Design goal:
2 copies of one chain form a homodimer. The first copy, chain A, is of the alpha/beta class. In chain A, about 50% of the residues lie in helices and about 15% in strands. The longest helix of chain A has 14 residues, at about 20-35. Bound molecules: ligand C2E (2 copies). The PDB classes it as motor protein.
Chain lengths: ~140, ~140
């Protein structure tokens, strides 16, 4: 679990998705634009799925390649108001071994959601459009 | 599209997923061994998904991150015998606009499968694990 102590750029370098010169160029650009590093690398050719798998490794989330098969448990969605699910980007979908399963849209929100839910939870990560489709399934109307 | 005219090394270089030095070493080893180039590159640290994304662009295939969302259509599976689907590494999964949708395990087989099917087809490419999971669902023993 040593990947949780790595910077994003280092994780992608170790995997081989970017070169050291591309990373330095990206950090140089960031110093003047303020954009997130991952957004710059994606614009420069990194697949968004590769970006999210690295961010999932960094924060201890399970990346979901697909949300199409999930049937959200209504009892789990009760654990967050719809307005909170939207604002925190978090969808409770079910339960495993006394933990609530929660699908995040942004790995940076893991800590704020965990503190709020205040109970054992297992966190997943989904790309924006898969997250949005799951959210409407779980929190209709 | 003009991507179909490029060598694999050229495609990886233009996408920024391989260095010129790493490609040259792999091509020199291949002169000595005859191994498939992408096999040498992945062994030297190229992400397998980078290899498959490049090979998909080269053969005009859509790369599939996951097959877990696919519900294989039984009538499409009739278009190949199970033994053929396995030998050719091809799973017919459905139909769209009068084309059969077919998920391949190896882009080098696209031409052999297309001639056999002998009808309009749209081809996809999936990583080995995702392919095998789809095949087992489409063609139970
Ligand atoms: N939803 C989303 N989240 C993203 C994205 N990119 C990064 N995140 C995460 O947001 C945190 C802050 O990203 P940053 O603003 O680019 O701020 C970065 C960045 O300025 C820099 N950095 C990242 N990687 C490297 C590296 O390899 N070497 C060096 N010298 N600095 C790095 O260190 C700071 C902290 O990096 P991290 O620990 O990895 O923490 C990162 C990462 O967890 C994105 O595109 N989308
Ligand atoms: N499923 C799968 N398919 C793979 C893999 N590696 C290559 N393929 C594909 O198989 C064809 C033959 O690969 P090769 O024997 O290594 O034979 C290659 C290789 O010897 C060489 N080559 C590839 N890229 C370059 C390059 O950038 N520069 C130079 N000078 N030669 C290259 O030219 C030949 C033609 O390569 P391509 O037109 O790209 O056609 C390649 C590519 O379509 C793999 O690991 N898995």
């Amino acid at each position: 679990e040593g990947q949780k102590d790595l910077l994003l750029g280092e994780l992608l370098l170790q995997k081989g998705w970017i070169s050291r010169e591309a990373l330095e160029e990206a950090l140089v650009e960031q110093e003047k634009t303020g954009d997130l590093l991952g957004r710059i690398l994606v614009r420069k050719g990194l697949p968004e799925e590769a970006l999210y798998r690295a961010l999932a490794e960094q924060k201890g989330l399970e990346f979901l390649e697909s949300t199409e098969g999930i049937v959200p448990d209504p009892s789990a969605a009760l654990l967050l108001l719809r307005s909170d699910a939207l604002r925190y980007g978090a969808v409770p979908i079910g339960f495993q071994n006394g933990e609530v399963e929660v699908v995040l849209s942004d790995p940076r929100h893991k800590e704020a959601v965990a503190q709020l839910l205040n109970r054992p939870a297992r966190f997943y990560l989904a790309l924006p459009q898969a997250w949005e489709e799951l959210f409407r399934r779980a929190y209709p109307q």
